Design an enzyme around this catalytic site. Structure first.
Site, PDB file in Angstrom:
ATOM      1  N   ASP A 158      64.374  67.302  45.055  1.00  0.00           N
ATOM      2  CA  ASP A 158      64.580  67.733  46.432  1.00  0.00           C
ATOM      3  C   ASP A 158      63.298  68.272  47.068  1.00  0.00           C
ATOM      4  O   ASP A 158      63.219  69.447  47.440  1.00  0.00           O
ATOM      5  CB  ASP A 158      65.716  68.762  46.519  1.00  0.00           C
ATOM      6  CG  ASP A 158      66.426  68.734  47.862  1.00  0.00           C
ATOM      7  OD1 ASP A 158      66.228  67.760  48.622  1.00  0.00           O
ATOM      8  OD2 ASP A 158      67.187  69.682  48.156  1.00  0.00           O
ATOM      9  N   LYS A 198      61.143  68.953  49.908  1.00  0.00           N
ATOM     10  CA  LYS A 198      61.225  69.151  51.349  1.00  0.00           C
ATOM     11  C   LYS A 198      60.247  70.273  51.714  1.00  0.00           C
ATOM     12  O   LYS A 198      59.835  71.020  50.824  1.00  0.00           O
ATOM     13  CB  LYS A 198      62.662  69.502  51.752  1.00  0.00           C
ATOM     14  CG  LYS A 198      63.188  70.779  51.117  1.00  0.00           C
ATOM     15  CD  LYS A 198      64.679  70.968  51.338  1.00  0.00           C
ATOM     16  CE  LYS A 198      65.193  72.140  50.517  1.00  0.00           C
ATOM     17  NZ  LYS A 198      64.805  72.027  49.080  1.00  0.00           N
ATOM     18  N   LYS A 216      65.320  85.201  42.047  1.00  0.00           N
ATOM     19  CA  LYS A 216      66.552  84.477  42.306  1.00  0.00           C
ATOM     20  C   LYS A 216      67.629  85.064  41.403  1.00  0.00           C
ATOM     21  O   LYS A 216      67.445  85.170  40.190  1.00  0.00           O
ATOM     22  CB  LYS A 216      66.363  82.985  42.032  1.00  0.00           C
ATOM     23  CG  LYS A 216      67.443  82.093  42.623  1.00  0.00           C
ATOM     24  CD  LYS A 216      66.973  80.649  42.675  1.00  0.00           C
ATOM     25  CE  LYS A 216      67.855  79.806  43.581  1.00  0.00           C
ATOM     26  NZ  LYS A 216      67.372  78.400  43.662  1.00  0.00           N
ATOM     27  N   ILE A 242      66.101  87.765  50.203  1.00  0.00           N
ATOM     28  CA  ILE A 242      65.581  86.627  50.991  1.00  0.00           C
ATOM     29  C   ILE A 242      66.593  85.480  51.110  1.00  0.00           C
ATOM     30  O   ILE A 242      67.228  85.081  50.133  1.00  0.00           O
ATOM     31  CB  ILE A 242      64.213  86.063  50.494  1.00  0.00           C
ATOM     32  CG1 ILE A 242      63.438  87.031  49.570  1.00  0.00           C
ATOM     33  CG2 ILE A 242      63.374  85.553  51.666  1.00  0.00           C
ATOM     34  CD1 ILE A 242      63.222  88.456  50.055  1.00  0.00           C
ATOM     35  N   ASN A 244      59.865  73.925  50.341  1.00  0.00           N
ATOM     36  CA  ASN A 244      59.293  74.065  49.006  1.00  0.00           C
ATOM     37  C   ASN A 244      57.773  74.153  49.002  1.00  0.00           C
ATOM     38  O   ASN A 244      57.195  74.891  48.208  1.00  0.00           O
ATOM     39  CB  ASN A 244      59.756  72.916  48.111  1.00  0.00           C
ATOM     40  CG  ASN A 244      61.227  72.596  48.289  1.00  0.00           C
ATOM     41  OD1 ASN A 244      62.067  73.493  48.376  1.00  0.00           O
ATOM     42  ND2 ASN A 244      61.546  71.312  48.349  1.00  0.00           N
ATOM     43  N   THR A 257      66.926  67.934  56.696  1.00  0.00           N
ATOM     44  CA  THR A 257      66.506  66.653  57.230  1.00  0.00           C
ATOM     45  C   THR A 257      66.632  65.645  56.106  1.00  0.00           C
ATOM     46  O   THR A 257      66.124  65.910  55.005  1.00  0.00           O
ATOM     47  CB  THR A 257      65.038  66.686  57.679  1.00  0.00           C
ATOM     48  OG1 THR A 257      64.215  67.020  56.561  1.00  0.00           O
ATOM     49  CG2 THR A 257      64.822  67.713  58.744  1.00  0.00           C
ATOM     50  N   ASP A 270      60.911  75.753  43.873  1.00  0.00           N
ATOM     51  CA  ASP A 270      62.163  75.096  43.488  1.00  0.00           C
ATOM     52  C   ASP A 270      61.936  73.886  42.589  1.00  0.00           C
ATOM     53  O   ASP A 270      62.625  72.874  42.708  1.00  0.00           O
ATOM     54  CB  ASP A 270      62.985  74.706  44.727  1.00  0.00           C
ATOM     55  CG  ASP A 270      63.800  75.866  45.289  1.00  0.00           C
ATOM     56  OD1 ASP A 270      64.034  76.862  44.568  1.00  0.00           O
ATOM     57  OD2 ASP A 270      64.218  75.773  46.462  1.00  0.00           O
ATOM     58  N   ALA A 295      73.608  81.633  45.198  1.00  0.00           N
ATOM     59  CA  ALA A 295      72.177  81.913  45.151  1.00  0.00           C
ATOM     60  C   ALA A 295      71.772  82.999  46.140  1.00  0.00           C
ATOM     61  O   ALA A 295      72.138  82.960  47.318  1.00  0.00           O
ATOM     62  CB  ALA A 295      71.374  80.646  45.400  1.00  0.00           C
ATOM     63  N   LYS A 296      71.013  83.972  45.646  1.00  0.00           N
ATOM     64  CA  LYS A 296      70.451  85.003  46.503  1.00  0.00           C
ATOM     65  C   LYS A 296      69.056  85.408  46.036  1.00  0.00           C
ATOM     66  O   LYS A 296      68.891  85.985  44.960  1.00  0.00           O
ATOM     67  CB  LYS A 296      71.374  86.221  46.566  1.00  0.00           C
ATOM     68  CG  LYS A 296      71.548  86.757  47.976  1.00  0.00           C
ATOM     69  CD  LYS A 296      71.521  88.279  48.019  1.00  0.00           C
ATOM     70  CE  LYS A 296      72.864  88.898  47.666  1.00  0.00           C
ATOM     71  NZ  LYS A 296      72.838  90.371  47.882  1.00  0.00           N
ATOM     72  N   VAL A 297      68.047  85.098  46.841  1.00  0.00           N
ATOM     73  CA  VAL A 297      66.698  85.519  46.504  1.00  0.00           C
ATOM     74  C   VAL A 297      66.421  86.909  47.039  1.00  0.00           C
ATOM     75  O   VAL A 297      66.837  87.269  48.137  1.00  0.00           O
ATOM     76  CB  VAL A 297      65.618  84.543  47.000  1.00  0.00           C
ATOM     77  CG1 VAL A 297      64.236  85.163  46.846  1.00  0.00           C
ATOM     78  CG2 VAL A 297      65.694  83.242  46.221  1.00  0.00           C
TER      79      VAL A 297
END
Lengths: 271, 274
Positions: free
Chosen positions: B122, B124, B28, B10, B127, B157, B140, B11-13
């Site tokens: 963070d 946003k 993760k 889906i 999350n 953003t 997260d 760092a690599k999920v």
């Protein structure tokens, strides 16, 4: 008069000047919104100054047209696309090519700066290429121009001083962004990685970045001086123009433009 | 693999299935090198372990942690529901009461995390997450400390980001987390960002000023809460306690209840990675 095509207040429709049969992009805007604005007078001035600006690296605005409700700004159409499209095809670019391009940008910016104008949103969207392949910078003196699920960037260049949310020296801000553009061309990414926004801001404030190995020491030095967070200690346009890395294969363009044409035109710019 | 049948990616999920129970998770996966050799290895450790030990209906769960000589593996609860804001796209604004529900869930979750000593840093839309049941769950959390999380394509953003953060220096994490909740709540109700995204330097100006214009449909009390949350001063910004006591926030609200053991021997926390 223009044979307009198509296409919240900046619908840049394509068009053509019928009478010389040339087609030039038109940025269209509500007449009302601008004319009432703290910066309206500066807008007029900046619009007028550029309108008379003529430089190989600066995208020109041929004419301003007036309506009851709308203002039409007539701007040169550059086919060569965005320069960063060229980067994407290749990843990063070469030292030589990069320097050629950077020189052009700096010269154009110097020209604009000389006439008292500052960009304030200098980014790659603005970087453009003419058919022959030369860099034309865009949206100059257009920043003042008034003002969902997807929002696209990038605020990476935004100089720290802007981050404060107060007042910034325009020139210092423009050069900072110029530093970033130089960085991206050589390296094929942003000096501060976007994904973590709070961290991005910390990085910008500290001016802490990952230089690539392939960057020569000078380039690095120039970038460090360009990317000083402190507007007072940062390099001048003059300073960079006299740089060792910048200097190579350098050659100064010199333009021949009208001393600012009757302001009367400036006051009459909008009606 | 280590109880898990991994998919991709889906760092690599990555998507994975817990085989033994035969249930499904996302993972993760990251280098050991990058995490261990960071200013914040210790903070990372502490927060990660706290999350592993956390259990809450609105918080995406960290089941366990897998470690390799070459890389670290983080297992997380999988949520089918997806981004809450997809819902916003369908119907623009959400209604006052519903928005209130979601806000309650989010505030509850953040508060619980904050108490446990962890801060998001963070917050946003990415999350904010939904489950099959339609409940909210927040991802997260405790991973901002994660190193360098996560070219032309950028989908960030800065509107949610608190002003103090804008400086690039220091802030108490909570105040920033509260700010984002303030923005998050605002967007749900209004079907837009409080501060226009375009003309970013002016955008930053607005944020630092905390200058925003609420829609007429906003009721007086919600406006008050938003205004109080959206204080550009973090010493004068409302605390979770204050917002929980708030009138509009009070309405129909019911404290969530969940049971987790007192933080398991940190020794485990230090031994988390080896």
């Amino acid at each position: 008069k223009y044979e307009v095509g198509r296409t919240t207040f900046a619908k840049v429709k394509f068009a053509r000047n019928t009478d010389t049969g040339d087609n030039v992009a038109i940025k269209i805007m509500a007449k009302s919104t601008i004319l009432k604005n703290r910066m309206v007078d500066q807008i007029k001035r900046e619009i007028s100054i550029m309108k008379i600006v003529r430089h190989p690296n600066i995208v020109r605005l041929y004419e301003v047209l007036a309506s009851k409700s709308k203002i039409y700004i007539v701007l040169e159409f550059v086919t060569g696309g965005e320069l960063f499209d060229r980067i994407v095809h290749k990843g990063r670019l070469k030292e030589d090519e990069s320097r050629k391009y950077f020189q052009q940008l700096v010269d154009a910016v110097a020209h604009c700066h000389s006439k008292g104008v500052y960009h304030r949103d200098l980014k790659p969207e603005n970087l453009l290429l003419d058919t022959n392949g030369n860099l034309k910078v865009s949206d100059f003196g257009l920043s003042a121009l008034p003002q969902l699920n997807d929002t696209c960037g990038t605020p990476n260049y935004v100089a720290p001083e802007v981050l404060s949310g107060q007042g910034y020296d325009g020139s210092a801000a423009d050069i900072w962004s110029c530093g970033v553009i130089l960085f991206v061309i050589l390296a094929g990414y942003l000096p501060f990685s976007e994904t973590d926004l709070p961290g991005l801001y910390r990085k910008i404030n500290a001016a802490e970045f990952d230089c690539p190995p392939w960057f020569s020491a000078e380039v690095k030095f120039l970038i460090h001086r360009i990317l000083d967070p402190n507007p007072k200690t940062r390099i001048q346009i003059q300073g960079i123009k006299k740089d060792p890395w910048f200097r190579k294969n350098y050659v100064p363009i010199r333009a021949r433009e009208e001393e600012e044409v009757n302001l009367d035109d400036i006051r009459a710019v909008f009606d």
